[PDB]
């Protein structure tokens, strides 16, 4: 591959030069003959595979702390070696773990919020042994990160994978989601996306309130055991009721959302170690709720009802009635959240901040991988600066990765 | 391998077999994806297999593979490349190759129309004056008094690079951009440089906001020459809003005919360096990009004024609100003037049905998500949720250098 690749911003004519792609460790799905850039998703590591992966990460860590080739660098390397050789694995020091987590976020090509990458509270839960223990650790995460509305980004890292039969997993794809219930008549109450998961919870013994906005319990799996249900204390789940600054009727829609966005289904990869339960949280970009959660057809799908209360001509599509409502909805989302002093960023601010971030990363690190398809907001795309920004996408390690759904893989005891 | 593409709204899965038939690179590799890069990066021996394969797919597409018609044609092309280092397409082959370059255009959301293409063979052309006549007839035909019709005009192929036919205008119809003293820019800032080349060539500009640039036509490697399209041929739409009576007072208008004239049509290893093609507008091209891009007409702020919007924080989404109203007015104007136009909801809806057709009958449809998804209201259109595979099928429209960077006078 060529040593320097060039990206161009077509609005400002600014050109950036990427050398960091040279450090790419994983495949993208693309080949020279086909591009998968818009495909959403394109038993354990052996001693021989583990050795070079660990060394790679160790070198990189001591390179970050400006002690490359130092006595402590060679000593850490030999210790990790000795350990992989005797135990087929090794354990990260707390410093390495925190560095690894921060960088996994730094390398997350789909995340537009990465300007904040180095401010990340890391909770080491590697001593956890039970699901009740996971529940404790998670509750602490939530209360900390929520911070009464002034959100702070946090990750909680549970023990690494060992033999594959003793995985820690959060079954919830996100820590906080609303239930979805499928009626006999074919309609769906709640959040239709979560119908399968809700069903799982119900089977496990969850008594459903059958409402539009019922917070799902946690379904926690420790040490490869069957998962266990727990209810998050409602006092720990901060929510924002949606209202509109101009339209007083908007509040009559009975809408609300949760303040804390937190992913719990991904796998954290550091130095060849796999952390299968590593829930992380930041704060919301308005469009995530106002556009996707609310306006996707297989989600809350409120465009129609909102348009009606707006007295919009809805026979032609060229009236653009869908669009007009969308903007209002997203205004009401940012307004509710700010009025309740819960941290939220609009899509203009977030994308602007990301460009400055990207530019700085090219300047200091020789590149910044980015997935244009994910980075560009799902509304008003071209009036945000990222739309006109060329981006190279490649996978750096440490990383957050996808993993199969646990209910597809679990061997029920 | 057979690849699957999933729409994440309907859960429809399509199996792509077509991609196995491609041979041009996309620029990506296993480790680096360049799907958001806009411009990623012929002898007798080179030319023949290219020629061979294309004749092969033509006789395959018309169900006469192995026929004597097929055989002779293969022998005919052989002898002609042999003795002239090039070869000439049959008319039927020209029309197929044009329609199929459109069909293979991964960046075009309009492809459901691909087989309804009017093809004007201008390969007998020899002078700029010729090109100008051919182009005027194109324009008049395709405009059709508002009921637009897809057209392409194809000039003589490349032979030796030194005798290239080129339309210097990136598009057939665009407005002039003027660089003011005070540093502001009049007209369309994107054309500023070209506008000034035209002036430097003898063009007397009216220095207004919407001045139709003249045609700059290069024939057979020669210096390009200026020609003004007759005004009566250039259909234009005044932009008014249905509810906002003040919108007319913004003084906005656009041309009704979108016609790309800077690309290269490639067929059977032949290079048609001059091949303007035209269609009709999707409303967002004008309403979003042309008008609201900071580097273009940049009307967003001015519009936001007249809507009496709070423009202090971005979180008031005032830019968004003004944008939707601009695009309503555009659609509304064209429609009121019986000028053909498609809204991005219908356009994207059409593209999805087209993808179904292509998978059903052809085993896939190359598509560039970055270009297919409209520049506004992305996820409330069907294609945002549609996985698409991009790959390069031939015949194709490729980019080419700007002529004012390679032409010797
Ligand atoms: C601090 C403020 C943050 C903001 C404003 C932000 C913003 C976003 C947005 C808008 C998305 C797209 C989400 C979607 O459409 O599903 C996203 C995705 C993502 N973010 Fe961030 N994020 C933040 C924090 C974090 C943190 C703390 C981490 C990890 C430590 C992270 C890693 C990721 C990853 C891995 C994805 C991909 C999600 C997926 O593949 O499903 N982000 N982020
Ligand atoms: C008939 C109705 C058509 C519609 C609604 C349509 C729609 C569009 C749109 C919206 C774009 C993006 C334009 C931009 O962002 O600059 C595009 C690109 C494109 N179209 Fe179509 N188009 C149509 C006809 C055609 C025809 C007749 C051809 C060729 C014979 C064609 C070939 C292409 C190509 C090659 C591109 C890529 C342009 C580039 O690379 O800059 N289209 N189309
Ligand atoms: C760290 C982080 C920050 C942020 N702004 N958003 C996220 C994703 C938030 C999120 C919350 N509830 C539900 C979802 C579902 C997304 C569904 N996608 C994967 C199809 C996503 C994560
Ligand atoms: C065939 C065709 C159909 C269509 N609907 N749009 C187009 C684009 C036409 C077009 C007209 N004037 C100006 C432009 C500028 C494009 C600017 N891009 C290249 C940066 C483009 C072409
Ligand atoms: C098909 C396509 O890849 C898919 O709909 C993507 C598009 N871009 C996205 N971007 C973000 N941030 N989140 C998403 O879920 C998606 N979905
Ligand atoms: C950076 C990116 O490649 C560039 O801005 C592209 C994005 N998608 C686009 N899509 C269309 N239809 N037209 C464009 O000009 C662009 N520009
Ligand atoms: Zn790619």
């Amino acid at each position: 591959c060529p040593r320097f690749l060039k990206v161009k911003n077509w609005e400002t004519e600014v050109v950036l030069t990427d050398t960091l792609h040279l450090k790419s460790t994983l495949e993208t799905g693309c080949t020279e003959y086909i591009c998968m850039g818009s495909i959403m998703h394109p038993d354990v590591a052996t001693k021989d595979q583990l050795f070079p992966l660990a060394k790679e990460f160790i070198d990189q860590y001591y390179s970050s702390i400006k002690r490359f080739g130092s006595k402590a660098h060679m000593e850490r390397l030999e210790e990790v070696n000795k350990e992989i050789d005797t135990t087929s694995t090794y354990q990260l020091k707390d410093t390495e773990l925190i560095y690894g987590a921060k960088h996994a976020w730094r390398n997350a090509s789909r995340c537009v919020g990465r300007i904040q990458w180095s401010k990340l509270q890391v909770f080491d839960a590697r001593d956890c042994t039970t699901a009740h223990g996971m529940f404790n650790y998670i509750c602490n995460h939530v209360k900390y990160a929520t911070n009464k509305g002034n959100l702070r980004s946090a990750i909680t890292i549970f023990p690494q994978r060992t033999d594959g039969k003793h995985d820690f997993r959060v079954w919830n794809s996100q820590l906080i989601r609303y239930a979805g219930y499928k009626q006999p008549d074919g309609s769906t109450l709640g959040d239709p996306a979560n119908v399968q998961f809700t069903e799982i919870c119900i089977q496990q013994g969850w008594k459903p309130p059958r409402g539009r906005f019922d917070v799902l319990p946690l379904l926690l799996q420790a040490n490869g055991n069957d998962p266990e249900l727990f209810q998050i204390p409602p006092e720990l789940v901060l929510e924002v009721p949606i209202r509109h600054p101009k339209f007083e009727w908007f509040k009559d829609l009975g809408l609300k959302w949760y303040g804390l966005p937190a992913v719990s289904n991904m796998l954290l990869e550091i130095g060849g170690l796999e952390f299968s339960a590593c829930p992380f949280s930041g704060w919301y970009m308005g469009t995530e709720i106002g556009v996707r959660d609310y306006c996707d057809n297989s989600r809350y799908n409120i465009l129609e009802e909102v348009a009606k209360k707006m007295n919009l001509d809805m026979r032609k599509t060229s009236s653009l009635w869908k669009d007009q409502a969308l903007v209002e909805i997203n205004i009401a989302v940012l307004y509710s959240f700010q009025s309740d002093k819960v941290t939220i960023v609009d899509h203009h601010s977030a994308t602007e901040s990301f460009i400055k971030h990207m530019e700085n990363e090219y300047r200091c690190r020789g590149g910044c991988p980015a997935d244009w398809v994910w980075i560009v907001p799902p509304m008003s795309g071209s009036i945000t600066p990222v739309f006109h920004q060329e981006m190279l996408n490649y996978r750096l390690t440490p990383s957050f990765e996808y993993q199969p759904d646990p209910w597809n893989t679990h061997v029920w005891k």
Side-chain angles (χ1 to χ4, degrees), chain A:
Chain A
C1 288
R3 181 144 162 252
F4 322 90
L5 298 162
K6 291 221 175 296
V7 309
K8 167 164 180 199
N9 187 297
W10 290 88
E11 170 162 87
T12 71
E13 303 292 304
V14 174
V15 180
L16 300 177
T17 320
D18 185 294
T19 60
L20 184 54
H21 75 263
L22 298 174
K23 308 284 179 63
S24 186
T25 113
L26 289 160
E27 322 313 310
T28 54
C30 295
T31 79
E32 195 173 308
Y33 273 2
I34 191 158
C35 165
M36 311 222 167
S38 71
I39 302 293
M40 207 180 305
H41 310 268
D43 239 48
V44 294
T46 79
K47 302 169 68 177
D48 300 276
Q49 300 175 344
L50 198 31
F51 287 124
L53 290 187
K55 175 188 186 301
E56 185 193 337
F57 164 80
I58 296 308
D59 291 351
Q60 178 195 136
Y61 170 75
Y62 281 85
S63 214
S64 93
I65 73 173
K66 297 305 189 313
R67 297 288 189 280
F68 183 89
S70 70
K71 183 165 175 297
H73 180 196
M74 306 297 103
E75 283 183 339
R76 176 54 180 157
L77 222 32
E78 172 63 32
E79 178 180 56
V80 165
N81 261 242
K82 247 193 192 283
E83 195 173 345
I84 291 178
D85 213 43
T86 49
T87 71
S88 293
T89 185
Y90 73 98
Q91 300 290 321
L92 299 161
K93 297 297 199 37
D94 304 358
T95 52
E96 293 164 351
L97 182 69
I98 298 150
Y99 165 89
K102 274 168 172 190
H103 276 68
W105 182 11
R106 188 185 203 188
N107 305 336
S109 73
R110 304 190 155 167
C111 179
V112 70
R114 277 175 291 166
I115 195 175
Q116 293 274 346
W117 74 270
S118 53
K119 265 181 303 300
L120 172 72
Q121 180 56 41
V122 177
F123 294 120
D124 184 359
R126 283 177 298 167
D127 67 21
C128 195
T129 72
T130 77
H132 278 102
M134 293 169 96
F135 168 73
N136 187 37
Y137 267 117
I138 293 182
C139 289
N140 288 328
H141 182 131
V142 176
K143 198 187 190 194
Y144 172 81
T146 293
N147 194 21
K148 306 172 156 295
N150 186 29
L151 312 199
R152 298 175 293 203
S153 54
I155 186 176
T156 291
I157 300 174
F158 291 110
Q160 64 211 51
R161 173 168 304 140
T162 57
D163 66 350
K165 301 154 185 200
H166 294 72
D167 287 350
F168 285 71
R169 291 298 295 282
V170 183
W171 283 42
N172 317 78
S173 58
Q174 297 83 30
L175 291 180
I176 311 173
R177 290 295 301 269
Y178 296 128
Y181 310 91
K182 189 84 170 188
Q183 309 307 325
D185 88 321
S187 73
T188 314
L189 184 47
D191 186 337
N194 302 310
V195 169
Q196 194 202 2
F197 187 71
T198 294
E199 285 178 2
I200 291 179
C201 294
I202 298 195
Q203 197 201 347
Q204 293 308 123
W206 185 56
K207 310 310 168 193
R210 305 202 150 257
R212 206 175 171 197
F213 300 100
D214 302 344
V215 182
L216 282 165
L218 292 175
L219 228 213
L220 312 181
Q221 164 180 333
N223 203 52
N225 303 317
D226 300 341
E228 302 174 22
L229 290 174
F230 302 89
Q231 193 193 34
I232 286 177
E235 64 252 43
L236 294 186
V237 185
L238 168 61
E239 292 181 310
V240 183
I242 310 310
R243 63 269 198 195
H244 194 289
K246 301 310 173 52
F247 306 137
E248 266 278 17
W249 50 261
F250 198 104
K251 62 210 213 322
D252 302 330
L253 295 173
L255 294 157
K256 60 178 185 170
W257 206 253
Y258 43 86
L260 181 76
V263 167
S264 56
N265 66 357
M266 291 178 76
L267 189 154
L268 171 55
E269 217 279 335
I270 297 157
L273 303 182
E274 305 186 284
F275 298 93
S276 57
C278 60
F280 52 85
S281 56
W283 57 79
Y284 260 128
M285 184 167 71
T287 60
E288 283 181 270
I289 305 174
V291 190
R292 311 300 313 286
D293 292 322
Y294 280 171
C295 298
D296 281 27
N297 286 317
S298 69
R299 300 298 310 290
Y300 279 91
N301 196 28
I302 59 159
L303 272 177
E304 167 139 293
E305 186 181 8
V306 175
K308 284 198 173 70
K309 317 223 75 176
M310 295 193 63
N311 290 314
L312 295 184
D313 185 272
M314 297 174 48
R315 291 168 298 177
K316 297 114 46 58
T317 65
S318 53
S319 68
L320 292 207
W321 65 266
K322 272 185 182 169
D323 316 68
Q324 226 148 19
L326 187 56
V327 174
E328 300 292 351
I329 283 159
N330 279 269
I331 290 174
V333 151
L334 291 157
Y335 172 72
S336 303
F337 264 71
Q338 282 163 12
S339 287
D340 288 354
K341 300 180 188 55
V342 187
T343 300
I344 196 168
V345 59
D346 68 62
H347 59 276
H348 294 300
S349 310
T351 52
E352 199 205 15
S353 290
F354 182 74
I355 291 294
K356 305 193 179 181
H357 167 60
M358 206 184 56
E359 296 197 320
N360 182 50
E361 290 276 279
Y362 273 83
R363 224 181 295 106
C364 80
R365 195 194 177 193
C368 169
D371 188 331
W372 188 103
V373 175
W374 273 62
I375 299 291
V376 178
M379 71 171 292
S380 319
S382 100
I383 58 170
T384 73
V386 287
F387 181 94
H388 311 261
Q389 180 66 48
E390 286 183 344
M391 298 177 196
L392 288 176
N393 194 20
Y394 47 96
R395 321 244 322 273
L396 291 175
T397 199
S399 64
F400 295 106
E401 315 283 15
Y402 297 120
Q403 44 178 348
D405 289 321
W407 57 86
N408 291 326
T409 50
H410 191 61
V411 180
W412 287 89
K413 290 205 180 312

